[PDB]
Design a protein around this ligand. Structure first.
Ligand SMILES: NCCCCc1ccccc1
Ligand SMILES: [Ca+2]
Length: 223
């Protein structure tokens, strides 16, 4: 997260860190045994880390649980990142509490101008590299579909939206991938891609979760 703030411990209780010996992507807890992330975060050997603030220190509210199954979206295209969504089932159910809680799926899509909360442990610089240990947060509005498509000609599909600031300075970045965009209490986006971070006229692109709710609900119910 570039241009954001320190969230504070456990203030984003649905935020997960995906770990394969190191943090590599975020995700969102959507019930006790299922996490939503980006398909581009797919890998073997994932441990889901719940209840994290500092990812390099054991602070007392963590739950570490191996993934038992990953399900990349049937139509994920790694070339274009269309359908950049993946479900991860936990080997055992998380113990739900204050510090570890699920986030609701959308009932309908969000509108341009709606403010959302984006969070992660990604790079905090556009001027180089610096990875935080504690969770970072950013409030940002959903941008109009036309400003998104103007920013990224030929590359935005109906399964994507842009959020942030065309002026630059405030964005998601490397390491935030797969994490949440929460608007009005619902998971409306997943950190998906962009051109650099926090650059002028290049806002972040996010998977549009409202298009996937029926797939998520059917998949969970069958698995
Ligand atoms: N604002 C876009 C978010 C950055 C996502 C990302 C994923 C993988 C490699 C670099 C960046
Ligand atoms: Ca920790």
């Amino acid at each position: 997260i570039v241009g954001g703030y320190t969230c504070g411990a456990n203030t984003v209780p649905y935020q997960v860190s995906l770990n394969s010996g190191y943090h590599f992507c975020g995700g969102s807890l959507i019930n006790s045994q299922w996490v939503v992330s980006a398909a581009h975060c797919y890998k073997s050997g994932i441990q889901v880390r719940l209840g994290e603030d500092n990812i390099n220190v054991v602070e007392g509210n963590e739950q570490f649980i191996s993934a038992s199954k990953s399900i990349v979206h049937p139509s994920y295209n790694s070339n274009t990142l269309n359908n950049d969504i993946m479900l991860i089932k936990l080997k055992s159910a998380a113990s739900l509490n204050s510090r570890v809680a699920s986030i609701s799926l959308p009932t309908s899509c969000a509108s341009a101008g709606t403010q959302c909360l984006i969070s992660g442990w990604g790079n905090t610089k556009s001027s180089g590299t610096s990875y935080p240990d504690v969770l970072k947060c950013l409030k940002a509005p959903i941008l109009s579909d036309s400003s998104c498509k103007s920013a990224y000609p030929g590359q935005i599909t109906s399964n994507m939206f842009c959020a942030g600031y065309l002026e630059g300075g405030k964005d998601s970045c490397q390491g935030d991938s797969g994490g949440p965009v929460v608007c009005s209490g619902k998971l409306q986006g997943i950190v998906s891609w962009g051109s650099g971070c926090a650059q002028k006229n290049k806002p972040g692109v996010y998977t549009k979760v409202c298009n996937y709710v029926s797939w998520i609900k059917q998949t969970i119910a069958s698995n």
